[PDB]
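Journal club prep, shared notes

We agreed each person brings one worked example of a sequence with its structure written out as tokens. Mine is Bifunctional P-450:NADPH-P450 reductase. I'm keeping it raw so we can talk through how to read the token line rather than staring at a rendered picture. Sequence first:
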Amino acid sequence: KEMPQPKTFGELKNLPLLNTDKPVQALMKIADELGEIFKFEAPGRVTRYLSSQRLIKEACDESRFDKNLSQALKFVRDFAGDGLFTSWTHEKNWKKAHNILLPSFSQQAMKGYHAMMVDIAVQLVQKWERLNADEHIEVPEDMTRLTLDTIGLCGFNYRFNSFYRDQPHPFITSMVRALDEAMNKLNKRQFQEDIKVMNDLVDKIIADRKASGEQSDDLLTHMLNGKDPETGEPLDDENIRYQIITFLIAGHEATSGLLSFALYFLVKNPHVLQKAAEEAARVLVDPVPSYKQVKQLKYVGMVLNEALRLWPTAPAFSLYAKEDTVLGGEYPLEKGDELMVLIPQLHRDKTIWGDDVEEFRPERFENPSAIPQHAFKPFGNGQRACIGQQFALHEATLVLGMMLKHFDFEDHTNYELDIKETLTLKPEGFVVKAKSKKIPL
Ligand code: HEM
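Then the structure, token by token:
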């Protein structure tokens, strides 16, 4: 009835406990010790971290709780503005952009993005085909080049050409710098300059596109042509800019993390790699994968969901109570009280997944309808769930399928998993060697 709480440090309350490079991983250990709910205080602030499916299912009831803008999201809003990710559900622009963009992110819409995804995926595979025998792959680095360039191409038909450079395109440098600064706040001169670099490029492309009248298969065309069904209003140019920034900010790192963790688990589990590779060989019979082929990569899809189970790459989200309510029959909350969903702990709930939760077993996802509601939430919840979920999974399934078709992989360093935390998670320093199977591409 009384909620556990970890060590306090006087006026600093619990804050010193997150004085670490790996706060989510620290929080998982606190959850291991304290159980399914604990209080966590800082000077300004109180939240309650939830870890069990029993309480998280209640937290996911949208009549009772809505998305909160956590401090991290408030700092990100300095450059992501009122784009979808950093808006309250009640802001007019959240609803407008959500209504306009939702069908442009459906599974069906992936058919329209597929050619541009393949363009970047082929660039990645060709890079690896072109390595000499003495060389190796920097996995999260190459995965981030791929996802950034894919979201730039599908997002606004802009080529960052990340596979042509050691130093990233200057927009990328400013975006990555801007993100780091917002996370570190949890400089100012550089922050403003980096914001300006982002707005300038994105505003220019928007202005260029409106001028030429060109129609493309990208999200920018959808946003220039879209009208909110409720009001009949379009998004204005400022908000369109924030959405483009948001697709890059929200999408690039979580998706490259997922591809990196999935390859990690595959090289650490050779039997699973071989089963995934046999499927990729059977299904991807053409030098350029089709949309329909990617959809037949069922076990690759299971591999990706099981990677998201263990290390969901956007690991926590924040909610507030809409009205006074009692959580789990035991914990009274007041209107506005905050909850944090700790997704890696949720995904380790032994009452749902059985005792073997640390084991990498894609077969858990063989029958998606036996996973209970709200047991598996790597893309968040309800109407504030990831709008990019189909995009991320189509991209990851395509790319992983191709990697497994085209190369054998060696964990040549016997890499020890080290999870770096930013807004997202990734296996820092993960490296492999890939030997080409010499299959046409
Ligand atoms: C595997 C990769 C990804 C993961 C694990 C992921 C995860 C998430 C999660 C957990 C949220 C909810 C945030 C919260 O409740 O505060 C979210 C929201 C969002 N994501 Fe993703 N994401 C991924 C990829 C992407 C991609 C590629 C894009 C864009 C193309 C994207 C765009 C967005 C947007 C715009 C939102 C806000 C949606 C709204 O609230 O209306 N994400 N994502």
